[PDB]
Every structure is written in structure tokens, then in C-alpha cells.
Design an enzyme around this catalytic site. Structure first.
Site, mmCIF file in Angstrom:
data_model
loop_
_atom_site.group_PDB
_atom_site.id
_atom_site.type_symbol
_atom_site.label_atom_id
_atom_site.label_comp_id
_atom_site.label_asym_id
_atom_site.label_seq_id
_atom_site.Cartn_x
_atom_site.Cartn_y
_atom_site.Cartn_z
ATOM 1 N N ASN A 69 2.538 -1.900 9.054
ATOM 2 C CA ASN A 69 3.331 -1.106 9.977
ATOM 3 C C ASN A 69 2.435 -0.287 10.903
ATOM 4 O O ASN A 69 1.210 -0.380 10.806
ATOM 5 C CB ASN A 69 4.320 -0.210 9.222
ATOM 6 C CG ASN A 69 3.644 0.695 8.224
ATOM 7 O OD1 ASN A 69 2.455 0.986 8.333
ATOM 8 N ND2 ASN A 69 4.407 1.164 7.246
ATOM 9 N N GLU A 108 -1.561 -7.881 4.949
ATOM 10 C CA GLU A 108 -0.261 -8.537 5.147
ATOM 11 C C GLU A 108 0.696 -7.615 5.908
ATOM 12 O O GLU A 108 0.943 -6.495 5.441
ATOM 13 C CB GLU A 108 0.346 -8.895 3.776
ATOM 14 C CG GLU A 108 1.680 -9.665 3.822
ATOM 15 C CD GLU A 108 2.285 -9.969 2.429
ATOM 16 O OE1 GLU A 108 1.680 -9.639 1.377
ATOM 17 O OE2 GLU A 108 3.413 -10.511 2.399
ATOM 18 N N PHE A 134 0.862 -1.179 0.000
ATOM 19 C CA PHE A 134 0.000 0.000 0.000
ATOM 20 C C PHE A 134 0.893 1.222 0.000
ATOM 21 O O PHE A 134 1.517 1.542 1.013
ATOM 22 C CB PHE A 134 -0.876 -0.007 1.252
ATOM 23 C CG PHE A 134 -2.007 0.990 1.226
ATOM 24 C CD1 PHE A 134 -1.772 2.350 1.422
ATOM 25 C CD2 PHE A 134 -3.320 0.562 1.048
ATOM 26 C CE1 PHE A 134 -2.826 3.259 1.413
ATOM 27 C CE2 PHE A 134 -4.373 1.468 1.040
ATOM 28 C CZ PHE A 134 -4.127 2.816 1.221
ATOM 29 N N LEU A 135 0.976 1.892 -1.143
ATOM 30 C CA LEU A 135 2.000 2.902 -1.347
ATOM 31 C C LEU A 135 1.368 4.200 -1.840
ATOM 32 O O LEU A 135 0.654 4.214 -2.859
ATOM 33 C CB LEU A 135 3.037 2.380 -2.365
ATOM 34 C CG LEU A 135 4.492 2.856 -2.315
ATOM 35 C CD1 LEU A 135 4.589 4.344 -2.604
ATOM 36 C CD2 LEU A 135 5.156 2.530 -0.989
ATOM 37 N N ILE A 136 1.576 5.272 -1.079
ATOM 38 C CA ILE A 136 1.334 6.624 -1.585
ATOM 39 C C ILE A 136 2.707 7.278 -1.703
ATOM 40 O O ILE A 136 3.413 7.447 -0.679
ATOM 41 C CB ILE A 136 0.435 7.465 -0.643
ATOM 42 C CG1 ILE A 136 -0.969 6.829 -0.485
ATOM 43 C CG2 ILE A 136 0.351 8.922 -1.133
ATOM 44 C CD1 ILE A 136 -1.819 6.856 -1.734
ATOM 45 N N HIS A 154 -4.907 10.944 1.403
ATOM 46 C CA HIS A 154 -5.070 10.032 0.269
ATOM 47 C C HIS A 154 -5.190 8.579 0.703
ATOM 48 O O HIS A 154 -6.040 7.832 0.196
ATOM 49 C CB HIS A 154 -3.896 10.156 -0.698
ATOM 50 C CG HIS A 154 -4.012 11.297 -1.654
ATOM 51 N ND1 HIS A 154 -4.999 11.363 -2.612
ATOM 52 C CD2 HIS A 154 -3.248 12.405 -1.820
ATOM 53 C CE1 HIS A 154 -4.846 12.469 -3.320
ATOM 54 N NE2 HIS A 154 -3.792 13.118 -2.860
ATOM 55 N N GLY A 155 -4.302 8.176 1.609
ATOM 56 C CA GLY A 155 -4.310 6.824 2.116
ATOM 57 C C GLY A 155 -5.665 6.457 2.661
ATOM 58 O O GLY A 155 -6.207 5.398 2.316
ATOM 59 N N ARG A 214 -8.436 3.941 12.238
ATOM 60 C CA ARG A 214 -9.230 5.153 12.119
ATOM 61 C C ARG A 214 -10.440 4.891 11.250
ATOM 62 O O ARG A 214 -11.573 4.973 11.714
ATOM 63 C CB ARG A 214 -8.398 6.281 11.510
ATOM 64 C CG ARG A 214 -8.559 7.627 12.225
ATOM 65 C CD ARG A 214 -7.995 8.803 11.402
ATOM 66 N NE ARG A 214 -8.607 8.831 10.071
ATOM 67 C CZ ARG A 214 -9.648 9.593 9.733
ATOM 68 N NH1 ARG A 214 -10.191 10.409 10.632
ATOM 69 N NH2 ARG A 214 -10.146 9.532 8.499
#
Ligand SMILES: CC(C)(COP(=O)(O)OP(=O)(O)OC[C@H]1O[C@@H](n2cnc3c(N)ncnc32)[C@H](O)[C@@H]1OP(=O)(O)O)[C@@H](O)C(=O)NCCC(=O)NCCS
Lengths: 313, 12, 39, 361
Positions: free
Chosen positions: A252, A249, A214-216, A225-226, A261
Site C-alpha cells: 500500500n 507483495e 507486514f503488520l504492526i 517500529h515498522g 524512506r
């Protein structure tokens, strides 16, 4: 000062995304590329440019140094770096050839008409759209090979995924106007066996869906955005009748809080905050039903319920 | 595709 | 590694134990999965 | 580690992992292991008794025997071994199975593909000759008494009927067209009395129907060949198969185009497979890596902490590492859940039960 010939790879590697402005930043991790110490020895005043077009993510590489030890056993930094980028898709050293190449690519560049749209949202007066694709598609493979090095640079223990596994599904976050890529999420699905009765009833196959990477991209972080992207995915999975649970998976702490949240306010919005913190007298089959309705992973579900029980005791 | 073994007796 | 995006190695190997203890239920469960033959 | 270094390590942790483990040296190695459905009975001395069928393999030095073994287990399993019956056998016993509908009858098959019918009370009853070479495949329908399915290295499969009168020495039906290489295994389905499955060295897995002229309903290509397959005792659609590539695959009978999933853990070929009759979703596997592994299909794809992911996939419940050679056969006891009998090449039969502390139990 002979120690200037040893560099921290995290410092040497300069990552840039070039749109209107060239935005430059550092990797969080370099160890899967340059070794566990994340040090590079033998190069003086070493700079490593890894740059991408903000739209097509056409990768460019250019290594600079004032001196390099001649003797072998010292690392070919460019060769190492290129072995983690797509073969014959990287322009080496020639900035202007690189700009030419992606200027020509932006003409035909449209994810918006090759991928299935998922949802659309608004942040700080800008419009963003979320797209979805498999990884067997040639154009999805072109983009993914370009961006996957970001998984390695910014997610610990990340590995390159098997593009031949059809159960891979990637979500793409574009800026609708500029067509720029803000982030991507690699997702997978595993058979979920619900016991003999269910299995034999629904001939329609059931899956646990999983967020893996999961990358921004750093320039677009800390703007919401996330959360919006996490929320879009979960929502489309809530609408997918083949999905039974939502799993993650190795997340962090940052994703821990992001998940907490958004999951927390979904429950509040559905009124489960009030159901749980005001009605201890619930059948165990209501608790199961709630969880299944919510498609939440079991341990995550328990955390949120306990968290609600205590928050308004 | 199993490979049948060669047999051996007991050392006592 | 079926569907693994984070199955690579970590930067460093942790020296501190998130649980020193004798035996407990999840310690037995972890022991069994290891087949009782790890270090 | 060495295998002997590793064995002492395993032995030092036995009290934590197992409720029970017993180890037994056999004069000759067995190639087959089945618990009998003899009901739990407590004996004088605080023991409960169970019975076990095992065989011999001498490679021709001595004579071979079909053996019946009495196992005396601790009452708290809800302690030695003893051979109560010993019948001479033609060649090695590659597989021996009791008839579900009549446990006085044991079917065996040998290294030349000859099939035998033994009685516990009287001994050798019948010889069923058709296959012309060694056979590992032998299966009784649990749904039609006496219906027997055998399979050989000579690519052939035979159906017999032995649960009536008449002469049973002649097959009711045979197939030369099912597979073009060794038959590794065949099994009856557990709900459909007409279904059976075949897996062969020709990398095919086949679902077949005895009533039909064109026998085969489904053909599946297998990554590398499967050595075994097993049907669920709870789901009428679920089956499992595994072989040379080490993975244990699950298939849905309603759609055999792709597998449902494959489970990773074994480091070499898988030779035996079984579904638990006691717990829906539990699969036990064994093979050339000297290991038995127990699996829980309900944990397939479950969320793990990264520390747990390091010990294996979430569906793996337990690994049995008590054997010091390849596992020849194992069987799950049908009366006492989690009780296992397993036998390795180096003349060792172990009898064991996992710890009750395991969430799954
Ligand atoms: C997801 C990501 C983009 C952050 O998204 P996010 O939803 O914005 O995350 P956060 O909630 O923590 O941060 C938003 C906060 O910044 C604030 N903020 C919003 N706009 C801002 C702005 N223009 N200027 C400064 N602060 C701002 C907000 O007020 C908000 O705080 P609040 O909750 O008190 O209201 C990013 O941090 C991330 O996780 N990237 C992935 C990198 C990675 O390592 N992934 C591994 C996962 S497998």
C-alpha cells in the site's frame, strides 16, 4: 427506528488488545468475514468483542445485542467470526475464564527461547527484539493462527497463508521486557534462476525473498517500529547468501513510503547518493553490480536512482 | 496418462 | 496461490481505468498473458 | 464462454498478439509434430521454406501415413502448406522424431509399440519390435548418433542403436524393472551422453544412466503422475516435468529431493513440455485444457503490480488459445526463434509466432 438493526461491521467489531490497559480499536476491513457491503442485518445494538491477550494473544469472543430477528437467513455472527479464529482456542463470553486461561499461559510463554533471534533495537527508551520462526513449528502455528485474523482486518485482499508450505517464514517483534507482541511479518522465498552459467556454478540454491503481510498492531503504530522492523529484516536478508533480491507483495502507499524512506537512506549511508548524482559516466555493469550488492528489486532500484538523480541535480 | 482420441475425417 | 498473502479479493471492483488507450507494448504483453480471451 | 465464442474472441486479437498465425485442416488428426532442421531458404515469391513431420490417426477406417510437409512462410517472419512426401505406416503414429545427426532418418512408434525407421528418400527401412503395446515415448540422443530410446504402456523401456551398420532391429538393452506402470515419456539429457529420464503412471520420475548395472541414479515421487519431462539446452542441471496436476515443475539434478518451483497456469493435465534452444530459461507447455503456455524461468518470483498478478504468475509470458480441443503435440522451430507448430484433436494444425513486442523477444 428499525434501521438500527443494520450495523456497519467495521463499527460493530470491537478489537481489543489487553495488557495492563484494554486498548480498543476498529478494523479497517470486515468484508472477507461479513461480506462486501460490510453490513450486518438483523441485530439491534450489535456489539462484537474480539479481544486478545497482549502477550499470548489468547483470543476471546463475545457477541452482544438487545434484539435479533428470529427468522433464519440472518447471519450467525459469532459462528462466522469463530470460523476465522483457531478451532477450540477461543474463549466465548466468559471474560474471567479467559483471563484465567491466559494468566496461566504467561507462565510458560517464551518465544525468546523457541525462536531464533534476529536482531535487537531501542525505541523511546524501551528495548525491542526481533525473532524468526518457521510455520511448521507447533508453537509458531499456535501464535500465528491467533494473530492472522489481523491480516484480514487491516490489510486489503489479505488471505490466510498455507501453514504446510515450508517456505513460509514469520518474523516476530517483541517488547523484550514485557514479552508483548508488537507486530509480525509473513515472508516467503522463491527460486531465483540466474541463467545457466550461475545456476550450474553455485550448487547453493538462490531465492528472491518476499515480504507478504507486514503488520504492526494499531496500538503500537506511528512510533517507528515498522521502519525498525523493516530494517531488521532487510539487514538479515543482506546477510543471507541464499537471498538475491528483496521483493514485496502488493504494498500500500504507507508501505510504499516506508520502503522508500529506509531504502533511500541505506543508499545515502553507502554513498550511492553521491555515486549516482555525480557520475553519469557509469558502465551498465556497475549499475547491475550496485543493484545486486544492494539486493534491491529492479524497478524499486530504478525509482531510487532517478529519485537521487533529480534530488541533487 | 494421455488419453488417445477417437479420430474423425474432414467435413469437406 | 504459491506463497500468496494478498491474493484475496479487493473490497470493491474499480470502475475507472488507470489506462484507457489503444494498444501499446505493455498492453500487448498483458493481452498475450490473457491469451487474448478476456471479455 | 463457449469454445467457439472464445475462438472468435481470440481471432479478433490475433493481429496484436502474433507476428504470424496460419491454420490448417487435416484430413486426419496428427498425434505428432516436429520441425525438421531444414535451413531457412528464401524462395521465388518472397517466401521462406520450412519442413514439418506430421502423422495420421484414423482409428482404423483408412490407412495411416508418415507425412512430410512444406511450410511457406512470409519473408518478414525473420502462405500455405504442402505435403511433399507421404509414406504408409502400420497403425497410428503416436510419435515421430528425426535423427539429429541425420535428418534423412525418421523414427516413429505406433499404437502397438512397434518402432520404425523411415528414410525420407527411400521410405520404410526397418521395423523394431519389442514393446507389446502402444507407446508415446521416443527419443534420440543428441550426443551419440543412432542411440534411440523407446517406451511403452506395457511398462517397458528399450535402447536401440541405429546410427551405424549391423542390424538395428534388435534392442541393445531393455528394462522391465524401471517402472511398474505405463511409460509416459523418456528423454536423453543434453550434456551427459549417458543420462536419461523416465516418467510413468506409477507416479515416479527417474534419472538413469545407461552405463550402470543399477541403471537408476535418482528416483522422485511425483504429486500425481508426470506425462512429460524436458531437459534444459543451456543448463546441465535443470529439468522440467509436468502432468496430471497441471503444474509445471522444475528440478535441479544435483538435488531431486524437492522441486525448485512449480508454475501455475494450466487448468488440466499437461501433455507436452519443451525448453527453448534459443533462449535460456524459456519453457513451453501444453495439454488437455486446449492451451499452450510459454514460461520464463527468470521471472519466477519477480515483483508484480497487483493488477498484473491478476493475469497470472510473473513467469507466464504468453498463452496460446487458438486451439479448440486438447493439444496433441507441438514443436519449437530450431531455425526461427518463437515459431511454433501445434496440433489439436479436431484435425487442426496451427503455425504461429508471438509478437515481437513481447519483452522476452
Ligand atoms: C509501520 C507502522 C508502525 C508505522 O511505523 P513508522 O516507522 O512509525 O511509520 P511513519 O514513518 O509513517 O511514522 C512515524 C512518524 O511519527 C512521528 N512520531 C514518532 N513518535 C511519536 C509519538 N510518540 N507521538 C506522535 N508522533 C510520533 C515521527 O516523528 C515520524 O515522523 P517523521 O518521519 O517526520 O520523523 C504502521 O504505520 C504500519 O504500517 N502498520 C501496518 C498496518 C498495515 O496496514 N500493513 C500493511 C502492509 S502489508
Amino acid at each position: 427506528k428499525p434501521e438500527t438493526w443494520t450495523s456497519s461491521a467495521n463499527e460493530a467489531l470491537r478489537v481489543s488488545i489487553v495488557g495492563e490497559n484494554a486498548v480498543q480499536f476498529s478494523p479497517l476491513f470486515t468484508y472477507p468475514i461479513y461480506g462486501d457491503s460490510e453490513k450486518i442485518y438483523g441485530y439491534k445494538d450489535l456489539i462484537i468483542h474480539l479481544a486478545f491477550d497482549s502477550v499470548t494473544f489468547k483470543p476471546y469472543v463475545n457477541v452482544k445485542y438487545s434484539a435479533k430477528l428470529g427468522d433464519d437467513n440472518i447471519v450467525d455472527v459469532e459462528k462466522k467470526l469463530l470460523s476465522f479464529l483457531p478451532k477450540d482456542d477461543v474463549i466465548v463470553r466468559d471474560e474471567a475464564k479467559w483471563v484465567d486461561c491466559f494468566a496461566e499461559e504467561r507462565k510458560t510463554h517464551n518465544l525468546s527461547d523457541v525462536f531464533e533471534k534476529v536482531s535487537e533495537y531501542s525505541l523511546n527508551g524501551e528495548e525491542f527484539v526481533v525473532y524468526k520462526s518457521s510455520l511448521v513449528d507447533d508453537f509458531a502455528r499456535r501464535m500465528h493462527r491467533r494473530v492472522q485474523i489481523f491480516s484480514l482486518l487491516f490489510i486489503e485482499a489479505a488471505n490466510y497463508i498455507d501453514e504446510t508450505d515450508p517456505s513460509w517464514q514469520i518474523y516476530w517483534l517483541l517488547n523484550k521486557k514485557t514479552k508483548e507482541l508488537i507486530g509480525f511479518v509473513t515472508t516467503y522465498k522463491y527460486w531465483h534462476y540466474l541463467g545457466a552459467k550461475s545456476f550450474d556454478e553455485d550448487i547453493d540454491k538462490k531465492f528472491r525473498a518476499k515480504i507478504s503481510q507486514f503488520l504492526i498492531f494499531p496500538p503500537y503504530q506511528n512510533k517507528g517500529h515498522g521502519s525498525c522492523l523493516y530494517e531488521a529484516i532487510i539487514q538479515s536478508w543482506l546477510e543471507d547468501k541464499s537471498i538475491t533480491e528483496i521483493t514485496v507483495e502488493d504494498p500500500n502507499e504507507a508501505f510504499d513510503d516506508l520502503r522508500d524512506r529506509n531504502d533511500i537512506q541505506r543508499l545515502r549511508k553507502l554513498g550511492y547518493d553521491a555515486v549516482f548524482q555525480k557520475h553519469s559516466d557509469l558502465s551498465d555493469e556497475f549499475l547491475e553490480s550496485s543493484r545486486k550488492s544492494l539486493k534491491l528489486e529492479e524497478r524499486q532500484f530504478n525509482r531510487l536512482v532517478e529519485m537521487l538523480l533529480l534530488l541533487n541535480n | 496418462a494421455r488419453t488417445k482420441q477417437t479420430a474423425r475425417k474432414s467435413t469437406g | 496461490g504459491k506463497g500468496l498473502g494478498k491474493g484475496g479479493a479487493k473490497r470493491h471492483r474499480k470502475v475507472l481505468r488507470d489506462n484507457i488507450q489503444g494498444i501499446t507494448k505493455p498492453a500487448i504483453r498483458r493481452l498475450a498473458r490473457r491469451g487474448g480471451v478476456k471479455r | 464462454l463457449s469454445v467457439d465464442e472464445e475462438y472468435d474472441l481470440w481471432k479478433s486479437n490475433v493481429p496484436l498478439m502474433y507476428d504470424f498465425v496460419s491454420e490448417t485442416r487435416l484430413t486426419w488428426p496428427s498425434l505428432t509434430v516436429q520441425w525438421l532442421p531444414t535451413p531457412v531458404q528464401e524462395l521465388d515469391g518472397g517466401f521462406i521454406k520450412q519442413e514439418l513431420i506430421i502423422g495420421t490417426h484414423t482409428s482404423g477406417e483408412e490407412e495411416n501415413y508418415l507425412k512430410f510437409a512444406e511450410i511457406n512462410l512470409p519473408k518478414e517472419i525473420l502462405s500455405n502448406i504442402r505435403i511433399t512426401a507421404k509414406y504408409e505406416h502400420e497403425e497410428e503414429i503416436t510419435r515421430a522424431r528425426y535423427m539429429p545427426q541425420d535428418p534423412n532418418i525418421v523414427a516413429t512408434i505406433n499404437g502397438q509399440g512397434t518402432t520404425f525407421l523411415y528414410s525420407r528418400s527411400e521410405g520404410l527401412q526397418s521395423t523394431l519390435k519389442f514393446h507389446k503395446d502402444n507407446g508415446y515415448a521416443l527419443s534420440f540422443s543428441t550426443l551419440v548418433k543412432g542411440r534411440l530410446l523407446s517406451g511403452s504402456d506395457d511398462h517397458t523401456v528399450a535402447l536401440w542403436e541405429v546410427g551405424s551398420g549391423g542390424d538395428p532391429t534388435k534392442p541393445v538393452r531393455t528394462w522391465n524393472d524401471l517402472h511398474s506402470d505405463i511409460i509416459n515419456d523418456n528423454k536423453w539429457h543434453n550434456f551427459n551422453k549417458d543420462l536419461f529420464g523416465t516418467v510413468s503412471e506409477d507416479s515416479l520420475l527417474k534419472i538413469n544412466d545407461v552405463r550402470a548395472n543399477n541403471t537408476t541414479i535418482d528416483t522422485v515421487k511425483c504429486p500425481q503422475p508426470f506425462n512429460t519431462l524436458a531437459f534444459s539446452h543451456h543448463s546441465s542441471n535443470l529439468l522440467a516435468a509436468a502432468g496430471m496436476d497441471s503444474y509445471v515443475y522444475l528440478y535441479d539434478l544435483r538435488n531431486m529431493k524437492e522441486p525448485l518451483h512449480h508454475m501455475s497456469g494450466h487448468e488440466d493435465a499437461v501433455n507436452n513440455l519443451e525448453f527453448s534452444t534459443h533462449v535460456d530459461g524459456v519453457v513451453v507447455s501444453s495439454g488437455s485444457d486446449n492451451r499452450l503456455m510459454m514460461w520464463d524461468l527468470k521471472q519466477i518470483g519477480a515483483e508484480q503490480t497487483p493488477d498484473d498478478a491478476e493475469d497470472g504468475v510473473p513467469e507466464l509470458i504468453m498463452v496460446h488459445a487458438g486451439h479448440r480441443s486438447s493439444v496433441n503435440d507441438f514443436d519449437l522451430n530450431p531455425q526461427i526463434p518463437w515459431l511454433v507448430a501445434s496440433a489439436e484433436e479436431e484435425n487442426i494444425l496451427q503455425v504461429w509466432k508471438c509478437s515481437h513486442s513481447l519483452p522476452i523477444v
